């Protein structure tokens, strides 16, 4: 695994080379030009459209076995394409999701034209989004980077049905449509960062709606800027035939498990908060293919590919957080409970948000008081036959759970006044929520 096999092709002639991963590609380029009877200057060597510099090595470019170097007749800043606005709008919106004065290139999109395809890539150094757009019209291979927001806004601002022609002029990118002309500043494609390749460890396909359910069921329970950096993300776990997400901030936990119809090795990784956000943005036809490595995750959706670094830490075991014997079960309509908590919350303490629950035979009383000595009281019919108890909660955490349960009836599983409560859909164990009480 010290050397690399490479194919160099000019569209008719193909020459193969074995070189050390640490050897500069200069000798390879000059030898190919020599076989063609052409001058070294008369050709440009493109790797996925990006111009290779003679001092770069395969290792520098993360090349892999049987990668292809395309020799093209010299064309300084040669990238050129013409595409329908409608074919660019969603790709541009998607990749512009993931920008400092010291890192201007991170506010740019990488554009690559190669093999009949326009690729657009956005990155923030820790995640990247790539879109592929088929080029139906004539084009010329090459690459550049261009300010993402300005390019998107220009394309969006052009009229419905416009064709957008793009080419390079010195250090600018010229965009033309109708009698509209725009010249944007560029930075070299060779300077755009790219995550090095990695090995997928577990791989599975699942419907977009299933992944969306898993994230929406738990996303609200993630920590915000917790020093326990692992809590700011979402645990993604494979076990048996299920995929599971877990989120917690130390006061509440959410766990959701869904079947994915294929038994898998057990694997457990932490996806960062911004990665969870980007994953959700992609879940707009076809299903979703997920690859999970030891330090990275990748999601393939249609003609998009999202990759994110993982959070390197030890996520808590939700199994240890679930109440051990929550033997007092209350069931109530979800909407009726939510509306009662929402009204009681109006007169709770604005900072601590405590409300008090009194459970008795088939009845729940919710009360709230604030420093002004205002008081709310709500009485509901519920199903409950356990011992009477009084337990306090942060009403925001309770409302967060009830809003995430999109169901007819909920079950609250109680132990005592100082122990966590487990809340689930009365009809489904797919998701579970655990909320610590406040002391009274």
């Amino acid at each position: 695994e010290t050397h690399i096999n490479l194919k160099v092709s000019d569209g008719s002639s193909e020459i193969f080379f074995k070189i050390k991963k640490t050897t500069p590609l200069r000798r390879l380029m000059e030898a190919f030009a020599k076989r063609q009877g052409k001058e070294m200057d008369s050709l440009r060597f493109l790797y996925d459209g990006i111009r290779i510099q003679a001092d770069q090595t395969p290792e520098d470019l993360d090349m892999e076995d049987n990668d292809i170097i395309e020799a093209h007749r010299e064309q300084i800043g040669g990238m050129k394409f013409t595409v329908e606005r409608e074919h660019l709008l969603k790709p541009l919106q998607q990749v512009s999701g993931p920008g400092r004065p010291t890192l201007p290139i991170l506010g740019n999109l990488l554009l690559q034209v190669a093999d009949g395809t326009l690729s657009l890539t956005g990155t923030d150094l820790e995640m990247e989004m790539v879109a592929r757009v088929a080029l139906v019209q004539p084009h010329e291979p090459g690459a550049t980077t261009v300010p993402a927001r300005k390019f998107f806004d220009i394309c969006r601002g052009l009229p419905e049905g416009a064709e957008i022609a793009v080419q390079l002029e010195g250090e600018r990118m010229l965009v033309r449509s109708g009698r509209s002309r725009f010249s944007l500043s560029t930075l070299p494609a060779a300077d755009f960062p790219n995550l090095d390749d990695w090995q997928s460890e577990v791989e599975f396909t699942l419907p977009q709606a299933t992944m969306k359910r898993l994230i929406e069921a738990t996303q609200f329970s993630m920590a915000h800027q917790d020093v326990r950096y692992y809590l700011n993300g979402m645990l993604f776990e494979t076990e048996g035939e299920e995929l599971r997400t877990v989120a917690t901030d130390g006061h509440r936990l959410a766990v959701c498990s869904m079947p994915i119809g294929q038994s898998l090795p057990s694997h457990s990784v932490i996806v960062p908060r911004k990665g969870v956000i980007e994953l959700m943005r992609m879940l707009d036809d076809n299903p979703l293919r997920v690859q999970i490595g030891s330090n990275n995750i990748r999601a393939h959706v249609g003609d998009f590919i999202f990759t994110s670094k993982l959070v390197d830490g030890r996520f808590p075991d939700y199994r240890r957080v679930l109440p051990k014997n929550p033997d007092k079960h209350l069931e109530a309509g979800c909407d009726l409970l939510k509306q009662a908590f929402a009204r009681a919350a109006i007169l709770s303490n604005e900072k601590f948000r405590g409300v008090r629950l009194y459970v008795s035979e088939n009845q729940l009383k919710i009360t709230a008081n604030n420093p002004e000595q205002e008081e709310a009281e709500e009485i509901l019919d519920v199903t409950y036959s356990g011992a009477e108890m009084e337990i306090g909660f942060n009403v925001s955490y309770v409302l967060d759970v009830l809003n995430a349960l999109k169901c007819e009836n909920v079950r609250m599983m109680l132990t005592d006044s100082v122990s966590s409560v487990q809340i689930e859909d009365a009809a489904s164990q797919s998701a579970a929520y655990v909320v610590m009480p406040m002391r009274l």
């Binding site: 326990r228 130390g250 936990l253 240890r320 957080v321 002391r439």
Partner: peptide, 10 residues
């Protein structure tokens, strides 16, 4: 304001 039994941190 007690926490869930997270190890560490509670």
């Amino acid at each position: 304001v007690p926490t869930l039994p997270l190890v560490p941190x509670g």
